[PDB]
Structure formats: structure tokens, C-alpha cells
Design an enzyme around this catalytic site. Structure first.
Site, PDB file in Angstrom:
ATOM      1  CG  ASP A   1      -1.722   1.287   1.423  1.00  0.00           C
ATOM      2  OD1 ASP A   1      -1.596   2.188   0.693  1.00  0.00           O
ATOM      3  OD2 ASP A   1      -2.424   1.311   2.358  1.00  0.00           O
TER       4      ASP A   1
ATOM      5  CE  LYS B   1      -2.212   6.860  -3.419  1.00  0.00           C
ATOM      6  NZ  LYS B   1      -2.489   5.978  -2.232  1.00  0.00           N
TER       7      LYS B   1
ATOM      8  CD  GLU C   1      -5.147   3.501  -2.689  1.00  0.00           C
ATOM      9  OE1 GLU C   1      -4.133   4.071  -2.821  1.00  0.00           O
ATOM     10  OE2 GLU C   1      -6.012   4.211  -2.305  1.00  0.00           O
TER      11      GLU C   1
ATOM     12  CG  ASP D   1      -9.238   4.487   2.292  1.00  0.00           C
ATOM     13  OD1 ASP D   1      -8.760   5.115   3.085  1.00  0.00           O
ATOM     14  OD2 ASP D   1      -8.669   3.886   1.309  1.00  0.00           O
TER      15      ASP D   1
HETATM   16  N1  LIG Z   1      -5.591   4.271  16.433  1.00  0.00           N
HETATM   17  C1  LIG Z   1      -5.923   5.331  15.340  1.00  0.00           C
HETATM   18  N2  LIG Z   1      -6.758   6.215  15.951  1.00  0.00           N
HETATM   19  C2  LIG Z   1      -7.063   7.427  14.996  1.00  0.00           C
HETATM   20  N3  LIG Z   1      -6.366   7.729  13.939  1.00  0.00           N
HETATM   21  C3  LIG Z   1      -5.361   6.804  13.532  1.00  0.00           C
HETATM   22  C4  LIG Z   1      -5.137   5.801  14.363  1.00  0.00           C
HETATM   23  N4  LIG Z   1      -4.061   5.137  13.671  1.00  0.00           N
HETATM   24  C5  LIG Z   1      -3.699   5.759  12.664  1.00  0.00           C
HETATM   25  N5  LIG Z   1      -4.300   7.064  12.727  1.00  0.00           N
HETATM   26  C6  LIG Z   1      -4.408   8.053  11.757  1.00  0.00           C
HETATM   27  O1  LIG Z   1      -4.460   7.323  10.343  1.00  0.00           O
HETATM   28  C7  LIG Z   1      -4.042   8.353   9.258  1.00  0.00           C
HETATM   29  C8  LIG Z   1      -3.173   7.403   8.283  1.00  0.00           C
HETATM   30  O2  LIG Z   1      -3.964   6.713   7.563  1.00  0.00           O
HETATM   31  P1  LIG Z   1      -3.401   5.340   6.874  1.00  0.00           P
HETATM   32  O3  LIG Z   1      -4.570   4.242   6.712  1.00  0.00           O
HETATM   33  O4  LIG Z   1      -2.160   4.703   7.674  1.00  0.00           O
HETATM   34  O5  LIG Z   1      -2.845   5.990   5.544  1.00  0.00           O
HETATM   35  P2  LIG Z   1      -2.909   7.127   4.287  1.00  0.00           P
HETATM   36  O6  LIG Z   1      -3.107   8.445   5.143  1.00  0.00           O
HETATM   37  O7  LIG Z   1      -1.880   6.837   3.554  1.00  0.00           O
HETATM   38  O8  LIG Z   1      -4.206   6.949   3.657  1.00  0.00           O
HETATM   39  C9  LIG Z   1      -3.410   9.239   9.947  1.00  0.00           C
HETATM   40  O9  LIG Z   1      -3.852  10.587  10.107  1.00  0.00           O
HETATM   41  C10 LIG Z   1      -2.936   8.646  11.316  1.00  0.00           C
HETATM   42  O10 LIG Z   1      -2.989   9.542  12.264  1.00  0.00           O
HETATM   43  K   LIG Z   2      -2.003   3.783   3.480  1.00  0.00           K
END
Ligand SMILES: Nc1ncnc2c1ncn2[C@@H]1O[C@H](COP(=O)(O)OP(=O)(O)O)[C@@H](O)[C@H]1O
Ligand SMILES: [K+]
Ligand SMILES: [Cl-]
Length: 380
Positions: free
Chosen positions: A8, A69, A173, A197
Site C-alpha cells: 500500500d 502521491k 485500493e 476509506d
Molecule cells: N488508532 C488510531 N486512531 C485514530 N487515527 C489513527 C489511528 N491510527 C492511525 N490513525 C491515523 O490514520 C491516518 C493515516 O491513515 P493510513 O490508513 O495509515 O494511510 P493514508 O494516510 O496513507 O491513507 C493518520 O491521520 C493517522 O494519525
Molecule cells: K495507507
């Protein structure tokens, strides 16, 4: 003989998995983190990728690159590029209508195509997988948003090739998340699946119809500028005000103090997904003054209530576009770290009149998980 991997390549965090011995394992990096920031930093002496890059972002904002990205596969004159540029601390230049990120590295001005920056993130994810597996990896599936066009897909594939991967396939995705839950396994008859998402920087709703293993994208909706970062920001503004009230000092124009507060807010936010309160403890936030305070889950929910609620209308829109009622959706799948927030789950579940949410796979890992399944399938 080497296992193939699923990656990913996230807007803000990337994740790598491997399917072997009948199961997926999501692979932790050197710091023990199961996702890795999509960050690359350049300094006077080294190039830093992932956690190391994100962890010095406050020190080195001009040369710490993220959001590649958003640029990848786009032309410099694309309105999205021209709009996004206004909000990044790093320089973007025009090389023959192609954007390049310009930085200082080892004392010299250098510029990189977005696919070169993303290749560095991909190299890190590959290396993470190799440390776990104990051998070099050469095959991968990499994922992209459903809305990515041919140029964005090719640029993403090129990032993989630069990283030394044979890219078995570029897959969507939402499709990857569906595969993670084995929704590709039903025979004849339509199954409608909604992928919700909410990541760090983007919010994507996809409705897929799956029929005898064939995926069709029926509808997409969302906001490419709504994500976890916006929730961190609501916390930042709240605490800037709290610091003003307590110390009669405004920290807002100190880029370092703000960025450090932002990091502490992101951490506290994560804690609030599993606890009803979190403490912040920033040493020397501003002029040697420490900031030791607390935030409840309810206060956080209050601060973000409009943003959380705003995720529902794109679900309504997607349903309309797909010509489906709520009841016609067979599976609801949570993707993106922000969907770990209890209040976000409540909103979506309530909107779907009490329906199950698929959330047994960490939402920030579901895309990598499905990519890893697909990689193993394509290897045979
Ligand atoms: N346990 C959690 N609770 C709330 N927010 C979270 C948690 N874990 C990760 N995040 C948030 O998820 C976001 C990242 O999303 P992610 O699915 O890793 O990938 P992407 O940002 O590349 O779409 C960040 O804003 C991060 O702070
Ligand atoms: K991600
Ligand atoms: Cl609610």
C-alpha cells in the site's frame, strides 16, 4: 521461491504485507511500526525515509518531502498540482510540464520526479519486507486509488521498477481491501460492497459490485482533502488557544512549536481511539515553556464533530450514483487509520441502521493485506 509482497503506497503512510504459509503477515519496520510514513527527507549528510524522515519534519521543513502521491503521474499545469503546491513547504518546479520536487541535499540543489520520491518510499517498504523474510524480494503488487488514470498508474508502476521490483499488477485500493476480506471468492450473483476509506489526507468512498470474482466500480465519492491531518489540526488550534490562555503567549507563528504540537496531537488522537482520555507532554514547546495537559475523547469528538459528520454525505452520494439503497449493500469495509476513531465508526454504523462493520483487519493495513493476497495469487 522468494515470496512476492503487497504494498500500500499511501498518501501519508505506507504498509507492506506478505502471504505465505496460508496467511498474511503485515510486516513491522525497524521501529516496530506496522505502517511507515510516506516521507523522504534530504539533509546535509543523508537521505532519510519513513519514520526517520517524519521525525525530523519540524527541523527540516523545506527538504522533507511528503504528498508525492498527489503529484505522481500529473502534469505541472494540472489544476490539482497548481492548487496543492500552494500548501506545501517544499519547492515544486516545472521540467517540460512535469513537476519535480526541488530540495537541498549534501549542500547541492537537486530535483526529483514524484515517481523517484515514491520509489524511495517503495525501496524502504521492500527493505522492511526483506529484513523479515531474510532474502531479497523481487515481485510486488502495488495499489492505487480507483480514480487514478493511466498516467498515474504508470508513474506508480515506474516508482516500483525504480525500486527494483517487478510489478505483478497495479490494483485499486478498494479492490485490495475487498480481497483482504475474501469478498472476491463468491460465485455467480452480485454482491455490493462499500469501502469507507478515511486515511491521513483523503477520504474515499467506493461501491463495488463483485460477481463471480469480477469487480466493477459502481460509484466513487469523497474528499481528497479530508483526513486524519484535519483532526490533528483541530486539536492544534484548540491547544494553541489553551497555551494563550495559560501563558498569555501565542505560539502560532513559530513553525517549530506548531509542528511539534501537531505531532503530539496526532499521538494523543491515536490514544483516544482506545482510551477516553490522553495526556500531552511537550518539553520546551515555546521559549523553554513546557506544555503538560490533557484531552478527553468527548472533547476531541466535539472539536471534530462537523468533520466526522461530513463523511456521511459522500456515502449518500455514492449510493445514489450506484442506484442502490442502504439495504442493497452487502458488506461495509473500514479502510484508513482514521476509521479506528470510535465516533467515526458510530456514525457509519448508525447511518447503516446498525450494520456490521468489517474492521477485524487494522483499517490502515487492509489495503496492504489484500495486495499481499493478490501478489501470492499472481505468483501461483
Ligand atoms: N488508532 C488510531 N486512531 C485514530 N487515527 C489513527 C489511528 N491510527 C492511525 N490513525 C491515523 O490514520 C491516518 C493515516 O491513515 P493510513 O490508513 O495509515 O494511510 P493514508 O494516510 O496513507 O491513507 C493518520 O491521520 C493517522 O494519525
Ligand atoms: K495507507
Ligand atoms: Cl453520533
Amino acid at each position: 521461491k522468494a515470496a512476492a509482497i503487497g504494498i500500500d503506497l499511501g498518501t501519508t503512510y505506507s504498509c507492506v504485507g506478505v502471504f505465505q504459509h496460508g496467511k498474511v503477515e503485515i510486516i513491522a519496520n525497524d521501529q516496530g511500526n506496522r505502517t511507515t510514513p510516506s516521507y523522504v527527507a534530504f539533509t546535509d549528510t543523508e537521505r532519510l525515509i519513513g519514520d526517520a524522515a517524519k521525525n525530523q519534519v519540524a527541523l527540516n521543513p523545506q527538504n522533507t518531502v511528503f504528498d508525492a502521491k498527489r503529484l505522481i503521474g500529473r502534469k505541472f499545469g494540472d489544476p490539482v498540482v497548481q492548487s496543492d503546491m500552494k500548501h506545501w513547504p517544499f519547492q515544486v518546479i516545472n521540467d517540460g510540464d512535469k513537476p519535480k520536487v526541488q530540495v537541498s541535499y549534501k549542500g547541492e540543489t537537486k530535483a526529483f520526479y514524484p515517481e523517484e520520491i515514491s520509489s524511495m518510499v517503495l525501496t524502504k517498504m521492500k527493505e522492511i519486507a526483506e529484513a523479515y523474510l531474510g532474502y531479497p524480494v523481487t515481485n510486488a503488487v502495488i495499489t492505487v486509488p480507483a480514480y487514478f488514470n493511466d498516467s498515474q498508474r504508470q508513474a506508480t508502476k515506474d516508482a516500483g521498477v525504480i525500486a527494483g521490483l517487478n510489478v505483478l499488477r497495479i490494483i485499486n485500493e478498494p479492490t485490495a481491501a475487498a480481497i483482504a476480506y475474501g469478498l472476491d471468492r463468491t460465485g455467480k450473483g452480485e454482491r455490493n460492497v462499500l469501502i469507507f476509506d478515511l486515511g491521513g489526507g483523503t477520504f474515499d468512498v467506493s461501491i463495488l459490485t463483485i460477481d463471480d470474482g469480477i469487480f466493477e466500480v459502481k460509484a466513487t465519492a469523497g474528499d481528497t482533502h479530508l483526513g486524519g491531518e484535519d483532526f490533528d489540526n483541530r486539536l492544534v488550534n484548540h491547544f494553541v488557544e489553551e497555551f494563550k490562555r495559560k501563558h498569555k503567549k501565542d505560539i502560532s507563528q513559530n513553525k517549530r512549536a506548531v509542528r511539534r504540537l501537531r505531532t503530539a496531537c496526532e499521538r494523543a488522537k491515536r490514544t483516544l481511539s482506545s482510551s477516553t482520555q490522553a495526556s500531552l507532554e511537550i518539553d520546551s514547546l515555546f521559549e523553554g515553556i513546557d506544555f503538560y495537559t490533557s484531552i478527553t475523547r468527548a472533547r476531541f469528538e466535539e472539536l471534530c464533530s462537523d468533520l466526522f459528520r461530513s463523511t456521511l454525505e459522500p456515502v449518500e452520494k455514492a449510493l445514489r450514483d450506484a442506484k442502490l439503497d442502504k439495504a442493497q449493500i452487502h458488506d461495509l469495509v473500514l479502510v484508513g487509520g482514521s476509521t479506528r476513531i470510535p465516533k467515526v465508526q458510530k456514525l457509519l454504523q448508525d447511518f447503516f441502521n446498525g450494520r456490521d462493520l468489517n474492521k477485524s483487519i487494522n483499517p490502515d493495513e487492509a489495503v496492504a493485506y489484500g495486495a499481499a493476497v493478490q501478489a501470492a495469487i499472481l505468483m501461483g
